[PDB]
Structure formats: C-alpha cells, structure tokens
Amino acid sequence: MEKYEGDWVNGKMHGHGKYIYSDGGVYEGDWIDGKMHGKGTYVFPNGNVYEGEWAHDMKDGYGVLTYQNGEKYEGYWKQDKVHGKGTLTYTRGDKYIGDWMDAKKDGEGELIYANGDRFKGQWADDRANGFGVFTYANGNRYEGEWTDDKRHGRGVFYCAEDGSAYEGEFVGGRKEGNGILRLATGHQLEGTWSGGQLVRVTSFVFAQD
Amino acid sequence: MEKYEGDWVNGKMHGHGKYIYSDGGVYEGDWIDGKMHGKGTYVFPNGNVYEGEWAHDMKDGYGVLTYQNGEKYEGYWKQDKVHGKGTLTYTRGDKYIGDWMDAKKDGEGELIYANGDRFKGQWADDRANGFGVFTYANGNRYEGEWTDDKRHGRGVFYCAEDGSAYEGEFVGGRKEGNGILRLATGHQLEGTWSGGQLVRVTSFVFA
C-alpha cells in the first residue's frame, strides 16, 4: 500500500511532499503536476539513494547517486540518464571525470585508475575513441589515436623497461606496419612490424647527435 | 765491358772474387764453379743492394735486400725468390713479418700498418686467406674467416663507434645472411642481412 504526505494543488501533488511507494523506498522534496520536480531525495528499495534536481518525474540537472556499494556519481542528468559533465567513482577506487552522453562516456574525459594508471583523451560509446594519452603505473606511456579502447592508428609508445620510444602505425592495440624505434643509446630503426614483432628493417642509423 | 779479380780453380772462378758486370753494378764474395755461391754482396745498377747467402748463382738462404727506395727485406730466399721466414719493411712504413712462398705471403703472417691498423692470421697468394684478426686504429676489430683480403664466412666484428658487436656470415667484406647483433645496452637482434643492410629480423630482445 502506497501513501503521500504533502501539499495538494488542483487535484495533484504540488509543492513539498513525502511519498512512500508500493515497493519499499520513499521520496521527499518538490512536486509539480503530481510528478517529482525540483530539488528532492529518493531512497530506493535496493539501498541506492539519489539527492539532487528532478524534472517531469525523472533526474534532470545536477544530482548525486550513491549506490549500496562504494559506486557514486556526482554530475548532471537529463531524463533519468547521466548526461553532460559528471564525476563517477567506481567501487574499485577508479574515477572518471568529464563528458557523458546518454549514460555513456562521450567527449573529453580523464579516467584515473586505483592501480596508478591514468588515461586522458576523447571518448565515444563509453570507450576511448580519437586522441588520448595513457600513462601506465610502471612508467610506460602511450600518446596518439584510439579505436574502441585500443591503440589504433598513428601513436608514440615509450617502454620504461628499455627506454626505446616507438613512432608509427598501431592495429588492434599492437604496433603493425611502418614505424620508427629509438633506443636510449640514440640507435634508431625504421621498417615494418607484424602483430608487435619487427619483420623488416628499412633503415638502421645511429646519429646520437 | 766485363772484368773479374779473384781466385781461379780448374778453368772457372772459385773462392773469394770481385766481379764488374757489362751493365753498371758489381759482386764481391764467394764463388763455386764460376757461379756466385756462399756469402757475398751484389750492388745492382738500379741501386738495389743484396748482402747474404747465394747458391748456383742465385740468392739462397738468409739475405738482406735494401731497395733504391726505403723498401728492405730481411729473411730467407730459395733460387732468387723470397721464401720461408721473412720481414719486409715497405717505403710506406708498413711491416710484414712471417711466412713467404715463391715471393708471395703464404702461411702465418703479421702485417703492422704505419696508420696503426694491424692484421695477424693466415695468408695465401700474398693476401689474407683463412682465419685472422684485423684490429683497426679507430678501435673497430674483426676476428674470423678471410677470402682474398676480404672478410668472408663466419666472423665477429666490433664497431667502436656504437660499441656494438656482430656474429654471423660475411660475403665480400660485408655482412650477408644469418647473424646476431648485440648493442652496448644488452639489446640483441637475430635475422638476415643483405649487402650491409638488415632485411629480416628472426628475434629482438633486451638483456
């Protein structure tokens, strides 16, 4: 059995009001035309809680959704979906700050991982797409083009293990086709890579300069 | 206008004797059966001078030939040809010490260059053939097989310029075919070289 305690206008809930839904979990805050509208808080049966701005019975504008588990989103909503600027903390400790579209990461975004890794760059369909920089915990670093959370196209990868930066084509997160490899010495290699293994050397200069 | 002044036996020059030849240039020393034989010296018209051992009218045994120019050979002769152990100084300043055959370098020999370079190894037909070590003035060094004064077959070459060492096949004084290349880092490369350019990579590692 559902129930309400608040302000009535015309024949509908309007103004401040607290509402208990048939399923466990309540709402307290602002109402317009019998819909949740304005600043209010919802406590869900599943233990999740939203407090922030509503419009036409949905989360719209700035709001904070904290989950039963660590997960917490602080940012903007449009029609009950995460939309625009937003910061999401994952249970893991990983954090995304940046641009959301239709409950997916889309645009400029920085994801700082709990393992010390961090990526900043362009996102599309909730995955890295376009330019970006991944800096690995170990000291390895990528800078260049991404396709579907994979290093794809022209990129520069540095390997902390042996120095030796690579400049060239990437395919499916591995270096493929023409490229250049500088080692810490000043030794450079030009040629072709096949699935991350060097096949052919075009040039083999030194020129430390 | 020939002439002689020395010892006669039977009907020929025999014992000590000095001889002036038709062309300018003389001989003074030992004679047998009217031939230069034993210890004696010849001063040639061309300005060359030999002093050493003779047999049957030719240089045979140990002798010293000093030339019109700086060139000087100290070693063994057989029938007027440089033969066996010998040391030759060139006008250049270069020195060869070692084994000669029929007036050509043949066997074990060390050539010390005036530019600081040095080769030691096996010679044939007056050129490096078989094993040997060339050490370059700059610090570069080769050790392995030679064919006709060229690095040919299995060899190890070190390049002082980039402190890298290569182990593999050489063809015509350049690295060709399968080989391994270690760099100063610890990075090693396996694969095939063509002329002196890497074509194909088998392995690539860091140590």
Author numbering:
A (entry chain AAA): 147 to 355
B (entry chain BBB): 147 to 353
Please, what does the article write about this entry?
High-resolution crystal structures and biophysical analyses of a truncated form of the TbMORN1 protein and its homologues from the parasites Toxoplasma gondii (TgMORN1) and Plasmodium falciparum (PfMORN1) enabled, for the first time, a structure-based definition of the MORN repeat. All three structures are antiparallel dimers joined via their C-termini, and, when possessed of the correct key residues, can adopt extended or V-shaped quaternary structures. The crystal structures confirmed that each 23-amino acid MORN repeat is composed of a β-hairpin followed by a 6-residue loop that connects to the next MORN repeat.
In comparison to the TbMORN1(7–15) C2 crystal form, the extended TgMORN1(7–15) structure has an approximately 1.5-times smaller dimer interface (601 Å2), which is contributed by residues from MORN repeats 13–15 only. This is closer in size to the 747 Å2 interface of the P21 crystal form of TbMORN1(7–15). In comparison to TbMORN1(7–15), the dimer interface of TgMORN1(7–15) is not built around aromatic stacking but instead employs hydrophobic interactions between Phe350 and neighbouring small hydrophobic residues, such as Leu335 and Leu327. In contrast to TbMORN1(7–15), where the dimerisation interface is centred around aromatic stacking, a hydrophobic core plays a crucial role in the dimer interface of extended TgMORN1(7–15). The dimer is stabilised by a single salt bridge formed between the Asp308 of one subunit and the His333 of the other subunit.
